Structures are given as C-alpha cells and as structure tokens.
C-alpha cells in the first residue's frame, strides 16, 4: 500500500547489494572526479613545453606526434566511461520493468531482478581485465624522462625533454592502485551474490 | 488511485520503448560526454602550434584561416544538439498533455501517445543522414599531415605542419563508429514500433 | 484531493502555454548551450594571436584595446541572461502564490495566473528589440579581416590581422538567425494568449 | 493532513518573503553566473600579456607581483560566497527544525521561524558594507592603463602596459551597480519584516 | 502513517546533528568551491612563467621538475576528497538500511543509527591530522620567491623566479585557517554526541 514514488526505490535498492553501492561511491568519487579535476590541468601543456634541441621548424611537431600517438588521459576517460556503461544499462532496465508492472496492478510484492545482476557483474568484470592489459602493454608504469627522435624533416637525431614526469608518474601509480582495488570489489560481489542464490532454491 | 507524482511517470515510461531508453543512454554517455571532456583539450591548440615555414607576419593567420574555415568540433557539437532536440520536444509535449488531463479527472487509464512517436522517430532519423552526408563531404575520414599555402600577403608557397593528426584521426574514427552504431538503433525502433501498431487494430 | 507535490505542478503547467514551453526549450538548448560550449573556445585567443606589424613594445596592447572595447561574447551572455530573468521572476512569483494558498485550505480549484502572464510576455518582448538594435549598431553583421591602427605609443600606422574571422562570422550569423526565430515565437504567444482572454469574459 | 514531502515546503516558503526570493534570484542569476562565465575569460591573461619595456629576465615577474598583490576576481568570488553563506545556514536550520518536529506528531499548524529571520538579515546586511568599503579602499573604481616599476632586480624605471583595461573597467562598474542595487533589496526587507512583527503582538 | 518518501528523510535527519550539517555546509561551500573556482586559475601558469636565467634548452624543465615534485593544488584536492569520503559512505549505509527495513513493515518508529556515527566521526577526525602533518612537513607555510638550481644538463647554478608568490601565500593561509576551523567543528561533535549517549542508558 504505497504510492508510485514508493515501490520504485525499494524495487531498485533491494536488487543491489551494499558492496555494489560502496563500489559505485568509490568509482565515482575517487576515479571520475580525480581524472576530471586534477588530470586535465596536468596534461594541459604536454605539447606546449615539449622542448627539443633543434632549430628547423617542423621537427618538434613530428617528434611529438611520434612520441605520443595517443595520450593516456583520454585512455583513462574512455576506460572509466566503458566501465560505468553496464551499471547504467541495468538501472535503466530495472526502472523500465518496475514502472510498467505497477500499471496493471495485482507485506510487499517487489519483483526479483537477480538473474539480471550476475550477467551485469560478469560483463563489468570482464571489461576491466582487457583494459588493464591494454594499459600495461601500451603505457607501461612510469613516464620516461627524455626521448630520442630520428624521423627526419630535420637533420640528425634530436633529444627532447618531457615536461613534469614525476607528477605524471605519481598520478599513474595512484590510478593504478585505485583500479586494482576496485577490481577486487567487483570480483567479491560475483562470488558472494552467486553462492547466496543456490542456497535459496530447494 | 495514485498521486500526481504517480500517473506522471507511467504516462511517460509506457510511451517509450526500451530501445529508445538505451539509445538515449548511449547517445548521452558515449557521445555528449566524450566530445565535451576529451574533445575540448585536443582541439585547444590547433592554431597556437600551426607552424609555418615563413617569416613575414600575417602569412600564418591567413594560411590557417584558409586551411580550416570551421573546425569539426563545433560541427560535432551542433550535430549532437540538433539530434537531441526532437527527443526533448516530444518529452515536453507529453508532460504538457499528461499534467493537464489529470486536472479535470474522470487498473489504470494512461493516455496513448503512440501516433506522436513515429513522427518523432522519422524526424530524428532524417536529421542524421543529412548531417552524415555533410560530415563526409566536408571533413572526409582522416586529417592531413601538412598543408600548402599560396594566398599571398607573404611571398611564395608556404608548407605548414598540422598538430597531432594521429590522435585527431583516431577520435574522428571513434565518433564515426559511434554515430554509425546509433543510426541503426534509431532505425530498428521505427520498424518495430510500427509493425506492433497495425496488429492492435481490428 | 491531491498532496502538496500534487497541485503544485498543475498550478504551474496550466498557467503556461505549449508555445512558451517549446520557446524555453529552444532558448536553453540552442542558445545558452552553444554560447557556453562553442563560444568560449573560439574567443579564447583573440588577443594572443592579434599579430601587428611592429616592433615597439606596447603598440599591440593599445591597438587591441582600441580595436575591441568589449568583445561580443560578453554581449551575448548578458543578453541571454537578461532575456531569461523575467521567465524566472514569474516562476518564483507563481510558486510563492501557489504554495501559500494551499496552507489555509478550502474537479480541481487551481488558481488563475493569467493577468501576470501578459505583462511578463510584454516585458520579455520589449527587452529583445533594444538588445537587437544595440547589437546591430555596435557589431554589425560580419567581422573585419584587418585593422589599421594610429594611436601612437608607436611610430606610424600599423596594420594588424584578426584571427579566424570566417568562423566568427559564421557563428554570429547562426546566433542572429536563432534570435530572429526566437523573437517571433515570443511575439506569437502574446497575440494568441490575449485574444483567448477576451473570449472568456461575458 | 499532508505527507512529509508536503509540510516541508510550506514550512520553508511561509517563513521567507517574496522580496527575499527575488533577491536570491537576482544574486544567483546576475552575480554568481556573470563572475564565473564572463569573469574568468577576461582575467585569464593578466600576467601573460603584461608587457614591460625591459630585457633583463625577472624584472617582469617582480613588477607584476608588486602591481597586483591579489586580483579582484578572487575578491569578487570570496565576497559572493561570504554573502550567500548566511542564506544557506538559515535554510539548513529551518530544514533541521522542521523535519524533526513532524516525527513526534500532534487548517495547518506550520511553525513560526520569524525571530530567526531578522538576525540572518542583519548579519547579511552587515557583511556587505565591510566588503564594499574594502573594495573601494583596495581597488578603487577604474583600472589603470600603465604602471611604473622601480623594485630592482633590473636596472632603472620600467613602464609596463596593462592588458584590456577598458573592458575591465566596464565589468567593474557593472558589478558595482549590481552590488549597490542588491544592498537596497536586503535593506528594505529588514525594515518591512520588522514593522510587520510588532503589529501582530497585542 | 507516511509514504516511502516520508520515513526516508526523518530516518536520515534524526541521525545527524545540526553541528554536522553546518560542518557539511562549511566544508562544501568554503572549501570545495574555492579550490575549484579560484585555485585552478592561480596555478594555471606555474610552469609557463617559471623564468630561469639561462640559455641552454632543457635546463628549465629539469629545474622546474626538481623545484616542485607535486604541486599543492592536487594535494588540496586529494585531501578534500578523502575527508568527504566517510561522510558519503555512512549516508549510503543509512539509506540502504532504511529503505530495506520498510519493505517488510511492522508516533514514529524510526531506526537508531547512533553506534554507526561515532566510528564515522573518529575516522573523519583521524584522517585530518595525518593530512595536516603531511601538509606542514611538505609545503611549509609560505611559498618562496626564488629558487637556486644545480642539477646540470646546463652549465652552472641557475637562479629562477617564482610566479606571483604573494597571492599563493595568501590563498594557502586562507585554506590553512579554513581547515583549522573545520577540525574543531568535527572534534566538538564527537565529545558532544558521546556524552549524550551514556546518559540515555539506565
């Protein structure tokens, strides 16, 4: 005996575990906020102050283009969005299936969206290992200090100096630690919400 | 027997299909977020580091002005806004026609806004083909690496070097793939929500 | 027989026409979003790359200061805010007069805020003609391509080159078209919501 | 006979006058939006283009540091936040005292938070005169056009040119007018909500 | 006898004291807003205008990298996020335990989340002393005005000039004062919400 803004929050809370909620808080307060606020200013002058020891115009542009085919700030952003996509698709599905069932009508009788949670957890877990492997195989662990350049529109070999590599290496380690910690939180929910299912099935 | 914050969400959910909701999520989490967050920093120094091999002041300004009459970041933003406009006009219309009917008053009796959905889908689908054609005929597929300039306030032919073309070409391909995938989602909803209409009409 | 979050949306929806709602959508999705997102990056380097053919320090600063006493981005922002102010004052007034009347108490009995709509429409319409006239008399229709400078801390006449004038001229024409189209929407509501009033008064 | 999302808006609306609501709208739509959106771009290159007629490195840095100990954009932001703080503390107090009283329980019986309004108005009014006096005694009314510098790491007296002083002086006058107009709105509410109190006390 | 959007706000308000609410307002209106809005522009050109008295390319990059291993803006942001994390975890826990208990069902009967408040307060208080100690031992109290550099890719000892140190020193003192004031607010809530607990236990 509740209103429509009643049994529309219980039907979404009772189908998600506390571990998932705290994972959501951790993944949106320590990952999607640090990247936007403290990641953009750091990588604002990666090309402006990429000083190369040369004088022929155009050597610096190609040298920088060869040095970094794609900066890892965009890699972090893409990985963060692709991790959060399944957590939104499932929420939309739950809302659609919960707000349409009350229209027909008949101490609560909330639906049971449990079979749609394990698949979501599996997809989210699988989407992180591939991204971690790509991160390791593309960017390594720490940024380099100087780069040698040989692609000639210019004459010779030009050694260029990277800008503020220590802070970049610190931020990379921080994000690595955050992702590693968040992987275990999502792995512990799949092994706990699946052993709690076969128990309640005589 | 529901309140006003009751039969004001069902009357908006029952008139939109799950395909449309997931298209909305995809078009606002992978298109309107990537452009704002990762598109602005990339195109921040397109003119600052457009190095030209010349010394007469003023050759660089006109050469850049001839090179790019309009950058494609603004094109992407305009296309994204113009695609989402019909999806907001219909929502406003539904809210206006749903919150006014309950004022008069008489196991639910929700209205049927189905004839106003096919027209919206047709307009949204038609608004994307023209923009795709314009994108292909204006910007091509990949960015160039060097530009020749002849418009003289300066003396001769000046070859200028574009800044970070590889990352720009990667982002353009990503956005092309996203738009191509989103077109089929909007096309499959029109062919499914129209065959499901003539069935329920004896 | 509704709650307080009941007859507090009808009392605000029944007093505003569909034309006004779609005008609100149009002038907040195509005017206040384009200016913020695509207007700031364009006018970010108007002074940084205002190249002048001189060598005496300080000629460029005064030449730019004489060239543009006030950029038109701030003009657009001020006009946009001053247009939207009346649409918020009336909403605040309606909420204040609707949430205080239900406290006393006595198939609905919603209030009639119609006399307070024509005055709002008249003020909003009058606030746009003056701004349009100021825009035409201050900035013209197209940006110039080069500027002559004579105010001497420097020696002679210095011709400076403006940065990316074609894109600026395209954006300003787009904004002109948007404002011109929005003026007629606000003019057609005053002539329709006033002829529909004298009819219902025997 | 209302819900909790019922007698939680009347208990906040009935304790605030229309003058206060319109002052809030004016102070958050014409003061906290202009500063953020149009104040940040103007003061973005105050140091980048502070051209000084010298050649010894380091003279420009100290000359700029002596010229502007603190820019007035931060002064405006601090004043704006410190003005709005009392208007939020009182709202939090009202919510806390209104949501806890309905738990115990017993044509409405709304509480009377009037003695807590005059003190808030007095504090808000007193917090603006001091800031106005500080603004006048620190920044004056109009920005200067050129600055003489004598603090030597360099040799001699160096005259530097300020960047775009006319637009800065226009924005300063606009903000001065806005603050002066807003002071009277807060002064007229204290003299009206206090004469309307002794009347209703036989 | 309330709805679900009823006994879901009382169960969260009655478990938090007014001191905590005003601390939240203070630590989100004077700490998380000043840093984002007035902290980013100040530290935007810390490396761009770090002038060094040398001519060999690459000396400036390493000199700046040695001078500031990590800027204190990121330190402030990390400390602010880590302070607010416990205040969000507890809120999520309260919502989860309050929205699930009403599903089963049985002048109010709100739960008592008091034992879960002292632990949260203790963790939040302990998380600030360590950060304050780190701030003192890493950045001191005032920024320096000039830096000597000896790490050679360059020849000799190079004295570089910091950019706008006075404003940085003023902002750092302001943030120090804000943090010091906020520490006592969180300390006085633990000593008051613990003496008020043993009283109500015969």
Swiss-Prot record, chains A, B, C, D, E:
GO CC terms of this entry: connexin complex
Top-level taxonomic group: Eukaryota
Protein's UniProt keywords contain Iron-sulfur: no
Keyword tags: Cell junction, Cell membrane, Gap junction, Membrane, Transmembrane, Transmembrane helix
Expression sites (tissue/organ): Expressed in pancreas, kidney, skeletal muscle, liver, placenta, and heart.
Membrane topology listed for this record: Multi-pass membrane protein
Any one Gene Ontology BP term: regulation of satellite cell activation involved in skeletal muscle regeneration
Primary localization: membrane
Topology Cytoplasmic: residue spans: 1-17
Extracellular side: 39-74, 142-170
Ranges that cross the membrane: 18-38, 75-95, 121-141, 171-191
Compartments where found: Cell membrane; Cell junction, Gap junction
Gene Ontology terms, MF aspect: gap junction channel activity
Summary of the function given for this chain in its UniProt record: One gap junction consists of a cluster of closely packed pairs of transmembrane channels, the connexons, through which materials of low MW diffuse from one cell to a neighboring cell.
Subunit-structure text: A connexon is composed of a hexamer of connexins.
Stated family: Belongs to the connexin family. Delta-type subfamily.
Full protein name: Gap junction delta-4 protein
Organism: Homo sapiens
Lineage: Eukaryota, Metazoa, Chordata, Craniata, Vertebrata
Originating gene: GJD4
